[PDB]
Coordinates of C-alpha atoms and ligand atoms in Angstrom, one line a residue:
Chain Z
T1 CA 12.0 -16.1 -20.1
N2 CA 14.9 -14.1 -21.4
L3 CA 17.6 -16.2 -23.2
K4 CA 20.0 -13.4 -24.3
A5 CA 20.8 -11.4 -21.2
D6 CA 23.4 -12.7 -18.8
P7 CA 21.8 -12.9 -15.4
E8 CA 25.2 -13.0 -13.7
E9 CA 25.8 -9.6 -15.1
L10 CA 22.4 -8.1 -14.3
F11 CA 22.3 -9.5 -10.8
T12 CA 24.7 -10.0 -7.8
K13 CA 24.2 -13.3 -6.0
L14 CA 24.5 -12.9 -2.2
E15 CA 23.5 -15.3 0.6
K16 CA 21.7 -18.5 0.1
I17 CA 18.3 -18.3 1.7
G18 CA 17.2 -21.9 1.7
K19 CA 16.6 -25.1 -0.3
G20 CA 13.5 -24.0 -2.2
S21 CA 11.2 -26.0 -4.5
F22 CA 13.2 -27.4 -7.4
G23 CA 16.3 -25.3 -6.7
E24 CA 18.2 -23.0 -4.3
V25 CA 17.1 -19.5 -3.5
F26 CA 19.5 -16.6 -3.0
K27 CA 19.2 -13.0 -1.8
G28 CA 20.4 -10.9 -4.7
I29 CA 20.8 -7.3 -5.9
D30 CA 19.5 -5.8 -9.1
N31 CA 22.7 -4.2 -10.3
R32 CA 20.8 -1.5 -12.2
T33 CA 18.4 -0.5 -9.3
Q34 CA 20.2 -1.7 -6.2
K35 CA 16.9 -3.3 -5.0
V36 CA 17.3 -6.6 -3.2
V37 CA 15.7 -9.5 -5.1
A38 CA 15.1 -13.2 -4.4
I39 CA 16.8 -15.5 -6.9
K40 CA 15.8 -19.1 -7.5
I41 CA 18.3 -21.1 -9.6
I42 CA 17.1 -24.4 -11.1
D43 CA 19.4 -26.8 -12.9
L44 CA 17.3 -27.8 -15.9
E45 CA 19.7 -30.7 -16.8
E46 CA 18.8 -32.1 -13.4
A47 CA 15.0 -31.5 -13.0
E48 CA 13.6 -32.9 -16.2
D49 CA 10.2 -34.1 -15.2
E50 CA 9.3 -31.1 -13.0
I51 CA 9.8 -28.6 -15.8
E52 CA 6.1 -28.3 -16.7
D53 CA 5.2 -27.5 -13.1
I54 CA 7.9 -24.8 -13.1
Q55 CA 6.5 -23.2 -16.3
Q56 CA 3.0 -23.2 -14.9
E57 CA 4.0 -21.4 -11.7
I58 CA 5.9 -18.9 -13.8
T59 CA 2.8 -18.3 -15.9
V60 CA 0.5 -17.8 -12.9
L61 CA 3.0 -15.5 -11.2
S62 CA 3.5 -13.5 -14.3
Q63 CA -0.3 -13.0 -14.6
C64 CA -0.5 -11.6 -11.1
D65 CA -0.1 -7.9 -10.3
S66 CA -1.1 -7.3 -6.6
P67 CA 0.6 -5.9 -3.5
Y68 CA -0.4 -9.2 -1.8
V69 CA 1.4 -11.5 -4.2
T70 CA 5.1 -11.7 -4.4
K71 CA 6.0 -9.9 -7.7
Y72 CA 7.7 -11.9 -10.5
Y73 CA 10.4 -9.9 -12.2
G74 CA 11.4 -12.3 -14.9
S75 CA 13.5 -15.3 -15.7
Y76 CA 16.8 -16.0 -17.5
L77 CA 18.4 -19.1 -19.0
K78 CA 22.1 -19.4 -18.6
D79 CA 23.6 -22.6 -19.9
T80 CA 21.6 -25.3 -18.1
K81 CA 20.5 -22.9 -15.3
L82 CA 17.1 -21.2 -15.1
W83 CA 17.3 -18.0 -12.9
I84 CA 13.9 -16.8 -11.6
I85 CA 13.9 -13.3 -10.2
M86 CA 11.2 -12.5 -7.5
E87 CA 10.5 -9.8 -5.0
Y88 CA 12.5 -10.3 -1.8
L89 CA 10.7 -10.1 1.5
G90 CA 13.1 -9.5 4.4
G91 CA 10.8 -10.3 7.3
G92 CA 10.8 -14.1 7.0
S93 CA 7.7 -16.3 6.6
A94 CA 4.7 -16.5 9.0
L95 CA 6.0 -20.0 9.9
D96 CA 9.3 -18.5 11.1
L97 CA 7.3 -16.1 13.3
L98 CA 5.8 -19.2 15.2
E99 CA 9.1 -20.7 16.4
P100 CA 9.1 -19.1 19.8
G101 CA 5.8 -19.7 21.5
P102 CA 2.5 -18.2 20.5
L103 CA 1.0 -15.5 18.4
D104 CA -1.6 -13.4 20.1
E105 CA -5.0 -12.9 18.5
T106 CA -4.1 -9.4 17.3
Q107 CA -1.1 -10.9 15.4
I108 CA -3.2 -13.7 14.0
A109 CA -6.0 -11.4 12.9
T110 CA -3.6 -9.0 11.2
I111 CA -1.8 -11.8 9.3
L112 CA -5.1 -13.4 8.3
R113 CA -6.5 -10.2 7.1
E114 CA -3.6 -9.6 4.7
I115 CA -3.8 -13.2 3.4
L116 CA -7.5 -12.7 2.8
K117 CA -6.7 -9.6 0.7
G118 CA -4.4 -11.8 -1.4
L119 CA -7.0 -14.5 -1.8
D120 CA -9.7 -12.0 -2.7
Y121 CA -7.4 -10.7 -5.4
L122 CA -6.6 -14.2 -6.7
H123 CA -10.2 -15.4 -6.6
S124 CA -11.6 -12.3 -8.3
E125 CA -9.0 -13.1 -11.1
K126 CA -10.2 -16.7 -11.4
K127 CA -7.0 -18.0 -9.8
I128 CA -6.5 -20.5 -6.9
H129 CA -3.4 -20.3 -4.8
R130 CA -3.5 -24.1 -4.0
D131 CA -0.9 -24.1 -1.2
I132 CA -2.0 -21.6 1.5
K133 CA 0.0 -22.4 4.7
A134 CA 2.2 -20.3 7.0
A135 CA 5.4 -21.4 5.3
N136 CA 4.1 -19.7 2.0
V137 CA 3.1 -16.4 3.6
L138 CA 6.1 -14.0 3.5
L139 CA 6.5 -10.8 5.4
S140 CA 8.5 -7.7 4.5
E141 CA 10.8 -6.1 7.2
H142 CA 8.0 -3.6 7.8
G143 CA 5.1 -6.0 8.2
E144 CA 3.6 -6.2 4.7
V145 CA 2.2 -9.7 4.1
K146 CA 2.4 -11.4 0.7
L147 CA 1.5 -14.8 -0.8
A148 CA 4.2 -16.9 -2.3
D149 CA 4.8 -20.5 -3.7
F150 CA 1.6 -21.3 -5.5
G151 CA 0.6 -24.9 -5.5
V152 CA 0.7 -27.2 -8.6
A153 CA -2.5 -27.7 -10.5
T154 CA 1.9 -33.2 2.3
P155 CA -1.9 -33.3 3.0
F156 CA -2.3 -31.3 6.2
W157 CA -3.6 -28.1 4.7
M158 CA -5.6 -29.7 1.8
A159 CA -9.4 -29.4 1.6
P160 CA -11.3 -32.7 1.6
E161 CA -12.6 -32.3 -2.0
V162 CA -9.0 -31.8 -3.1
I163 CA -7.8 -34.9 -1.3
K164 CA -10.6 -36.9 -2.9
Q165 CA -9.3 -35.6 -6.2
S166 CA -12.7 -34.1 -7.1
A167 CA -13.1 -30.8 -8.9
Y168 CA -12.4 -27.8 -6.7
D169 CA -12.4 -24.0 -6.9
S170 CA -11.5 -21.0 -4.7
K171 CA -13.2 -22.7 -1.8
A172 CA -10.3 -25.0 -1.4
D173 CA -8.1 -22.0 -0.5
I174 CA -10.7 -21.0 2.1
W175 CA -10.3 -24.4 3.8
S176 CA -6.5 -24.1 3.7
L177 CA -6.8 -20.6 5.3
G178 CA -8.8 -22.2 8.1
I179 CA -6.0 -24.8 8.7
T180 CA -3.6 -21.9 8.5
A181 CA -5.5 -20.0 11.1
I182 CA -5.2 -23.0 13.4
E183 CA -1.5 -23.2 12.5
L184 CA -1.0 -19.6 13.4
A185 CA -2.8 -20.2 16.7
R186 CA -1.2 -23.5 17.6
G187 CA 2.1 -23.6 15.7
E188 CA 1.0 -26.7 13.6
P189 CA -1.9 -27.8 11.5
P190 CA -4.4 -30.4 12.9
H191 CA -3.2 -34.1 12.8
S192 CA 0.5 -33.0 12.6
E193 CA 1.3 -35.9 15.0
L194 CA 0.1 -38.4 12.4
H195 CA 1.8 -39.9 9.4
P196 CA 0.7 -38.0 6.2
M197 CA -0.7 -41.2 4.6
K198 CA -3.0 -41.6 7.6
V199 CA -4.1 -38.0 7.4
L200 CA -4.8 -38.7 3.7
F201 CA -7.9 -40.7 4.6
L202 CA -8.7 -38.9 7.9
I203 CA -9.5 -35.5 6.3
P204 CA -12.4 -36.7 4.0
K205 CA -13.6 -39.2 6.6
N206 CA -13.6 -37.2 9.8
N207 CA -15.5 -34.2 11.1
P208 CA -13.6 -31.0 10.2
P209 CA -11.1 -29.7 12.7
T210 CA -12.0 -27.1 15.2
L211 CA -9.8 -24.7 17.2
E212 CA -9.4 -26.0 20.7
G213 CA -8.0 -23.9 23.6
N214 CA -8.4 -20.5 25.3
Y215 CA -9.3 -18.5 22.2
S216 CA -12.0 -15.8 21.8
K217 CA -15.2 -17.2 20.4
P218 CA -15.0 -15.2 17.1
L219 CA -11.6 -16.7 16.3
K220 CA -13.2 -20.1 16.9
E221 CA -16.1 -19.1 14.6
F222 CA -13.7 -17.9 11.9
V223 CA -12.0 -21.3 11.9
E224 CA -15.4 -23.1 11.9
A225 CA -16.6 -21.0 9.0
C226 CA -13.5 -21.9 6.9
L227 CA -13.5 -25.6 7.8
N228 CA -16.8 -26.8 6.5
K229 CA -16.7 -30.2 4.7
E230 CA -19.1 -28.7 2.1
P231 CA -17.0 -26.3 0.0
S232 CA -20.0 -24.2 -1.2
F233 CA -20.8 -23.4 2.5
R234 CA -17.4 -21.7 3.0
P235 CA -17.6 -17.9 2.7
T236 CA -15.6 -15.9 0.2
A237 CA -12.4 -14.1 1.2
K238 CA -14.3 -10.9 0.7
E239 CA -16.9 -11.9 3.3
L240 CA -14.2 -13.1 5.7
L241 CA -12.6 -9.7 5.7
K242 CA -15.8 -8.5 7.5
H243 CA -15.8 -11.4 10.1
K244 CA -16.0 -10.2 13.7
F245 CA -12.7 -11.7 14.5
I246 CA -10.9 -9.7 11.8
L247 CA -12.7 -6.4 12.4
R248 CA -12.2 -6.6 16.2
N249 CA -8.6 -7.7 16.3
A250 CA -6.6 -6.8 13.1
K251 CA -4.3 -3.8 13.3
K252 CA -2.0 -1.9 11.0
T253 CA 0.5 -4.2 9.4
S254 CA 3.4 -2.1 10.6
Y255 CA 2.7 -3.4 14.1
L256 CA 4.1 -6.8 13.0
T257 CA 7.6 -5.2 12.8
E258 CA 7.9 -5.8 16.6
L259 CA 7.3 -9.5 16.0
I260 CA 9.5 -9.6 12.9
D261 CA 12.4 -7.9 14.7
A262 CA 12.1 -10.4 17.6
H263 CA 12.9 -13.2 15.1
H264 CA 15.7 -11.5 13.2
Chain A
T1 CA -17.5 36.9 -2.6
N2 CA -21.0 37.1 -3.9
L3 CA -23.8 38.4 -1.5
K4 CA -26.5 38.9 -4.2
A5 CA -27.0 35.6 -6.0
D6 CA -28.3 32.6 -4.1
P7 CA -25.9 29.6 -4.2
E8 CA -28.7 27.1 -3.5
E9 CA -30.1 28.1 -6.9
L10 CA -26.8 28.4 -8.8
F11 CA -25.4 25.1 -7.5
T12 CA -26.9 21.6 -7.2
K13 CA -25.2 19.5 -4.5
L14 CA -24.8 16.0 -5.8
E15 CA -23.2 14.1 -2.9
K16 CA -21.2 14.8 0.3
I17 CA -17.7 13.7 -0.4
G18 CA -16.5 14.3 3.1
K19 CA -15.8 16.7 5.9
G20 CA -13.1 19.3 5.1
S21 CA -11.4 21.9 7.1
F22 CA -14.1 24.1 8.8
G23 CA -16.9 22.7 6.7
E24 CA -18.6 19.9 4.8
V25 CA -17.6 19.4 1.2
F26 CA -19.8 18.4 -1.7
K27 CA -19.5 17.3 -5.3
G28 CA -21.9 19.6 -7.1
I29 CA -22.8 21.2 -10.5
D30 CA -22.7 24.8 -11.5
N31 CA -26.2 25.1 -13.1
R32 CA -25.2 28.0 -15.3
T33 CA -22.0 26.5 -16.9
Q34 CA -23.1 22.9 -16.4
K35 CA -19.8 21.7 -15.0
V36 CA -19.1 19.7 -11.9
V37 CA -17.5 21.6 -9.0
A38 CA -16.4 21.0 -5.4
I39 CA -18.3 23.0 -2.9
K40 CA -17.2 23.7 0.7
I41 CA -19.8 25.3 3.0
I42 CA -18.5 27.0 6.2
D43 CA -20.7 28.3 8.9
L44 CA -19.0 31.6 9.8
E45 CA -20.6 31.7 13.3
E46 CA -19.5 28.1 14.2
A47 CA -16.0 28.7 12.8
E48 CA -15.2 32.2 14.2
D49 CA -11.5 32.8 14.9
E50 CA -10.6 30.5 12.0
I51 CA -12.0 33.2 9.7
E52 CA -8.7 34.9 9.0
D53 CA -7.2 31.5 8.1
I54 CA -10.2 30.9 5.7
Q55 CA -9.7 34.3 4.2
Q56 CA -5.9 33.7 3.8
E57 CA -6.5 30.5 2.0
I58 CA -9.1 32.0 -0.3
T59 CA -6.7 34.8 -1.2
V60 CA -3.8 32.5 -2.1
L61 CA -6.0 30.1 -4.2
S62 CA -7.5 33.1 -6.0
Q63 CA -4.0 34.1 -7.1
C64 CA -3.1 30.7 -8.6
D65 CA -3.7 29.9 -12.3
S66 CA -2.0 26.5 -12.9
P67 CA -3.2 23.1 -14.1
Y68 CA -1.2 21.8 -11.0
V69 CA -3.3 23.7 -8.4
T70 CA -7.0 23.2 -7.7
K71 CA -8.8 26.0 -9.4
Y72 CA -10.7 28.5 -7.3
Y73 CA -14.0 29.6 -8.8
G74 CA -15.4 32.0 -6.3
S75 CA -17.4 32.2 -3.0
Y76 CA -20.9 33.1 -1.9
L77 CA -22.2 34.2 1.5
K78 CA -25.8 33.1 2.3
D79 CA -26.9 34.1 5.8
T80 CA -24.0 32.9 7.9
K81 CA -22.9 30.2 5.4
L82 CA -19.9 30.7 3.2
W83 CA -19.9 28.6 0.0
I84 CA -16.4 28.1 -1.6
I85 CA -16.5 26.8 -5.1
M86 CA -13.5 24.9 -6.5
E87 CA -12.4 22.5 -9.2
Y88 CA -13.6 18.9 -8.5
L89 CA -11.2 16.0 -8.8
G90 CA -12.8 12.6 -9.1
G91 CA -9.9 10.2 -8.4
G92 CA -9.4 10.8 -4.7
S93 CA -6.4 12.0 -2.8
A94 CA -2.9 10.4 -2.9
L95 CA -3.6 9.4 0.7
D96 CA -6.8 7.5 -0.4
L97 CA -4.7 5.8 -3.1
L98 CA -2.5 4.4 -0.3
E99 CA -5.5 2.4 0.9
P100 CA -5.9 -0.7 -1.4
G101 CA -2.2 -1.5 -1.1
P102 CA 1.5 -0.4 -1.3
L103 CA 2.5 2.0 -4.0
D104 CA 5.2 0.9 -6.3
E105 CA 8.0 3.2 -7.4
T106 CA 6.6 4.0 -10.8
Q107 CA 3.4 5.2 -9.1
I108 CA 5.4 7.2 -6.5
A109 CA 7.6 8.9 -9.1
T110 CA 4.7 9.8 -11.3
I111 CA 2.9 11.5 -8.4
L112 CA 6.0 13.2 -7.1
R113 CA 6.8 14.6 -10.5
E114 CA 3.4 16.3 -10.7
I115 CA 3.6 17.6 -7.2
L116 CA 7.0 19.1 -8.1
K117 CA 5.4 20.8 -11.2
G118 CA 2.9 22.4 -8.8
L119 CA 5.7 23.4 -6.3
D120 CA 7.8 24.8 -9.2
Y121 CA 4.8 26.9 -10.3
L122 CA 4.1 28.2 -6.7
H123 CA 7.7 28.9 -5.8
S124 CA 8.3 30.7 -9.1
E125 CA 5.2 32.9 -8.2
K126 CA 6.7 33.6 -4.7
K127 CA 4.1 31.4 -3.0
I128 CA 4.6 28.6 -0.4
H129 CA 2.1 25.7 -0.2
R130 CA 2.9 25.1 3.6
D131 CA 0.9 21.8 3.9
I132 CA 2.4 19.4 1.4
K133 CA 1.3 15.8 2.4
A134 CA -0.6 13.0 0.7
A135 CA -4.0 14.1 2.0
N136 CA -3.6 17.4 0.2
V137 CA -2.6 16.0 -3.2
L138 CA -5.7 15.3 -5.3
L139 CA -6.1 13.3 -8.5
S140 CA -8.6 13.5 -11.3
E141 CA -10.5 10.6 -12.7
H142 CA -7.8 10.6 -15.5
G143 CA -4.7 10.6 -13.3
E144 CA -4.0 14.4 -13.3
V145 CA -2.4 15.4 -10.0
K146 CA -3.2 18.8 -8.3
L147 CA -2.3 20.6 -5.1
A148 CA -5.1 21.5 -2.7
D149 CA -5.6 22.8 0.9
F150 CA -2.8 25.3 1.3
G151 CA -1.4 25.9 4.7
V152 CA -1.7 29.4 6.3
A153 CA 0.9 31.6 7.8
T154 CA 0.0 18.1 13.3
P155 CA 3.7 18.5 12.8
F156 CA 4.8 15.3 11.0
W157 CA 5.4 17.0 7.6
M158 CA 6.9 20.2 9.0
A159 CA 10.4 21.3 8.3
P160 CA 12.7 21.9 11.4
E161 CA 13.0 25.6 10.7
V162 CA 9.2 26.0 10.5
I163 CA 9.0 24.5 14.0
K164 CA 11.8 26.8 15.3
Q165 CA 11.1 29.8 12.9
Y166 CA 11.2 30.2 6.4
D167 CA 10.7 30.0 2.6
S168 CA 10.0 27.6 -0.3
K169 CA 12.6 25.2 1.1
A170 CA 10.0 24.2 3.8
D171 CA 7.8 22.8 1.0
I172 CA 10.8 20.8 -0.3
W173 CA 11.2 19.2 3.2
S174 CA 7.5 18.4 3.3
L175 CA 7.9 16.9 -0.1
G176 CA 10.5 14.6 1.2
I177 CA 8.3 13.5 4.1
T178 CA 5.5 12.9 1.5
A179 CA 7.8 10.7 -0.5
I180 CA 8.4 8.6 2.6
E181 CA 4.6 8.6 3.1
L182 CA 3.9 7.3 -0.4
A183 CA 6.6 4.6 0.0
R184 CA 5.7 3.5 3.6
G185 CA 2.1 4.6 4.1
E186 CA 2.8 7.2 6.8
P187 CA 5.3 9.9 7.7
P188 CA 8.2 9.3 10.2
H189 CA 7.3 9.3 13.9
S190 CA 3.7 8.4 13.0
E191 CA 3.2 6.6 16.3
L192 CA 4.4 9.4 18.6
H193 CA 2.5 12.2 20.4
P194 CA 2.7 15.3 18.2
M195 CA 4.3 17.3 21.1
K196 CA 7.1 14.7 21.1
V197 CA 7.6 15.1 17.3
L198 CA 7.7 18.9 17.8
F199 CA 11.0 18.6 19.6
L200 CA 12.3 15.5 17.7
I201 CA 12.3 17.1 14.2
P202 CA 14.7 19.9 15.2
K203 CA 16.8 17.7 17.5
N204 CA 17.3 14.5 15.4
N205 CA 19.1 13.7 12.3
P206 CA 16.8 14.0 9.3
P207 CA 14.7 11.0 8.4
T208 CA 15.8 8.6 5.7
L209 CA 13.9 6.1 3.6
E210 CA 14.5 2.7 5.1
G211 CA 13.6 -0.5 3.4
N212 CA 14.0 -2.2 0.0
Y213 CA 13.6 0.8 -2.2
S214 CA 15.8 1.7 -5.2
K215 CA 18.9 3.7 -4.5
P216 CA 17.6 6.7 -6.5
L217 CA 14.4 6.9 -4.5
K218 CA 16.5 6.9 -1.3
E219 CA 18.7 9.6 -2.7
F220 CA 15.6 11.7 -3.7
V221 CA 14.4 11.5 -0.1
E222 CA 17.8 12.4 1.3
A223 CA 18.1 15.4 -1.0
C224 CA 14.8 16.8 0.2
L225 CA 15.4 16.0 3.9
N226 CA 18.4 18.2 4.7
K227 CA 18.3 19.9 8.1
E228 CA 19.8 23.0 6.4
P229 CA 17.0 24.6 4.2
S230 CA 19.4 26.3 1.9
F231 CA 20.9 22.9 1.0
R232 CA 17.6 21.5 -0.3
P233 CA 17.2 21.7 -4.1
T234 CA 14.5 23.6 -5.9
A235 CA 11.5 21.8 -7.3
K236 CA 12.9 22.6 -10.7
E237 CA 16.1 20.7 -9.9
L238 CA 14.3 17.7 -8.4
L239 CA 12.3 17.3 -11.7
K240 CA 15.7 16.2 -13.1
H241 CA 16.5 13.7 -10.3
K242 CA 17.5 10.3 -11.5
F243 CA 14.6 8.8 -9.6
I244 CA 12.0 11.0 -11.4
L245 CA 13.7 10.5 -14.8
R246 CA 14.0 6.7 -14.6
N247 CA 10.6 5.9 -13.0
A248 CA 7.9 8.6 -13.8
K249 CA 5.4 7.8 -16.5
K250 CA 2.4 9.5 -18.1
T251 CA -0.2 10.6 -15.6
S252 CA -2.9 8.4 -17.4
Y253 CA -1.0 5.4 -16.0
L254 CA -2.4 6.2 -12.6
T255 CA -6.0 5.5 -13.8
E256 CA -5.7 1.8 -12.9
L257 CA -4.6 2.7 -9.3
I258 CA -7.6 5.1 -9.1
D259 CA -9.9 2.5 -10.5
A260 CA -8.8 -0.1 -8.0
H261 CA -9.7 2.5 -5.3
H262 CA -13.3 2.5 -6.6
Ligands
LIG301 C1 9.4 -23.2 -9.3 C2 9.1 -21.7 -9.3 C3 8.5 -21.1 -10.3 C4 8.2 -19.7 -10.3 C5 8.6 -19.0 -9.2 C6 9.2 -19.7 -8.1 C7 9.6 -19.0 -6.9 C8 8.9 -19.1 -5.7 C9 9.3 -18.5 -4.5 C10 10.5 -17.8 -4.5 C11 11.0 -17.2 -3.2 C12 10.9 -15.9 -2.9 C13 11.3 -15.3 -1.6 C14 11.3 -14.0 -1.3 N1 11.7 -13.6 -0.1 C15 12.2 -14.5 0.8 N2 12.7 -14.1 2.0 C16 12.3 -14.5 3.3 C17 12.5 -16.0 3.5 O1 11.8 -16.5 4.6 C18 13.1 -13.8 4.3 O2 14.5 -14.1 4.0 N3 12.2 -15.9 0.5 C19 11.8 -16.2 -0.7 N4 11.9 -17.6 -1.0 C20 12.3 -18.5 0.0 C21 11.2 -18.9 1.1 C22 10.1 -19.8 0.5 C23 9.1 -20.1 1.5 N5 7.9 -20.9 0.9 C24 11.5 -18.1 -2.2 O3 11.6 -19.3 -2.4 C25 11.2 -17.6 -5.7 CL1 12.7 -16.7 -5.7 C26 10.8 -18.2 -6.8 N6 9.4 -21.0 -8.2
LIG302 C1 -10.8 27.1 4.2 C2 -10.7 27.1 2.7 C3 -10.4 28.3 2.0 C4 -10.4 28.3 0.6 C5 -10.7 27.1 -0.1 C6 -10.9 26.0 0.7 C7 -11.1 24.6 0.0 C8 -10.2 23.6 0.2 C9 -10.4 22.4 -0.4 C10 -11.6 22.1 -1.1 C11 -11.8 20.7 -1.6 C12 -11.8 20.4 -3.0 C13 -12.0 19.1 -3.5 C14 -12.0 18.7 -4.8 N1 -12.1 17.4 -5.2 C15 -12.2 16.5 -4.2 N2 -12.5 15.2 -4.5 C16 -11.6 14.0 -4.3 C17 -11.1 14.0 -2.9 O1 -11.3 12.7 -2.3 C18 -12.4 12.8 -4.7 O2 -13.7 12.8 -4.0 N3 -12.2 16.8 -2.8 C19 -12.1 18.0 -2.5 N4 -12.0 18.3 -1.2 C20 -12.1 17.2 -0.2 C21 -10.8 16.6 0.0 C22 -9.7 17.4 0.7 C23 -8.5 16.7 1.1 N5 -7.6 17.4 1.9 C24 -11.9 19.6 -0.7 O3 -11.9 19.8 0.6 C25 -12.5 23.1 -1.3 CL1 -14.0 22.9 -2.1 C26 -12.3 24.4 -0.7 N6 -10.9 26.0 2.0

């Protein structure tokens, strides 16, 4: 975190994107390069208790250097305001892409393949994303897929061993990926019609979810492979990149531009 | 071209690196000098009518002496098989380096600068590469960047005047397409039938770099991609472009990108 440079002089704040975690997020411009950036502004006089969580996500993001993880450019402290500068992705999130009707299996497999590449990077680096879900998968305007919004070290995407507050590892992300696969196919995770506190006990207690509907058997088997109650029986991201569903259906990421355009 | 010595004695093939143009290509060793080489073997009966193109590419490589152009060591004819011996580069092509993910602008500028050094050498020697594209830019294990696979005298990288019938400015246009390729993964009109692209390049406005790239990188592409060849800058001029000056780094920096590819 840089305390001397004035971020209001280095960056031009443009449109508010949304109410992000702990702050507001803006589309901005790097004045020196004219690249578009994403700018999160957090009032530190207001979010006292959450500060440790903010520092930890900055630390993890600063240790990542992958085309599948949104790049962290730096942070600045101006008066009581912490400015966090990130890579801007102009294609929306995967959740945004679900709003009208269904993804087809080609779209699902392409998106999942890129998420798997991000998870393979993270797991090979001994990191855990901890909040894999469509709302945290961001797309560029040309279809590149990147992970954002790491979880802190709502229950619908949480693995059973996470909910039971046991130790967990990279296999927790694999379960969340399986829920995210269902989300990409159905628009919502399993149990989304139930109160979160009820889902809290349902996930450890119940059989794992399965993907129901008219889907090709490999897509159902992909979901089944991810959603195993036993974490050590879930495959790695590297192995899932060779799953028949991925190899048979995933296409060049640039084909997502059609879907992205249709939502912009 | 040596007809007396037997290349299966002078060279040890180590591994097939891939198929090339007209023939299979191997990583091998010169047993006399004990240095690794690249070996292309062309069957001159199977490849008849391409022979003049083969000869023209041997001639132009044999006249180049630059660290920015793959060295030509000589050729051997055994029965109907022509062995072409060249410098071996162990880091892959620039196109290969596009595989494990998007290239950032520091990577792009470093590669473009080295390509421009090669083009400046060639153009100053009154030569034209004629097939500048990521697939024909090769990297050493240590990040050095060299031109290979010259064109002789697929349209996506071709200048409009080459399509319509040129000089060194054709390479500058192809360099601009290659900059787009390094930034986006593929040249403009990648999805279209090559015969459509044949009329589109002369007809249409020149391509621009679209997306969230720095203004200098976009300006570099625009400078290369001028429909008028005489308005494209020399390679020497482009070495001073703001994009190159602000982003290019030592070639050794690419070793991490090359290692990630392995
Ligand atoms: C507490 C903490 C600590 C360290 C880093 C962060 C942090 C994390 C995500 C972003 C971020 C980066 C970002 C980049 N691009 C975009 N465009 C998309 C929005 O859908 C298209 O406009 N939105 C972004 N959105 C909004 C959408 C979030 C969805 N989960 C962002 O919030 C940012 Cl700017 C910062 N936060
Ligand atoms: C008709 C003709 C006439 C005169 C010369 C040639 C000729 C041209 C290129 C090479 C050559 C030389 C060479 C040297 N190093 C490498 N390794 C890299 C490439 O991926 C890492 O293995 N590959 C090489 N590849 C394979 C990759 C080519 C990409 N377009 C080669 O083909 C060779 Cl050995 C000869 N051809």
